[PDB]
Amino acid sequence: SYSGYS
């Protein structure tokens, strides 16, 4: 998964 700001 990805968590945060992109």
Q: What is the DSSP string of 1-6?
A: ---S--
Place of tokens 């990805």: 2
Q: Resolution of the deposited coordinates, in angstroms?
A: 0.7
CB atoms within 10 A of CB 1: 2
- How many residues belong to the chain? 6
Q: How far apart are CA 4 and CA 6, in angstroms?
A: 7
Place of tokens 């968590």: 3
Obtained via which technique? electron diffraction
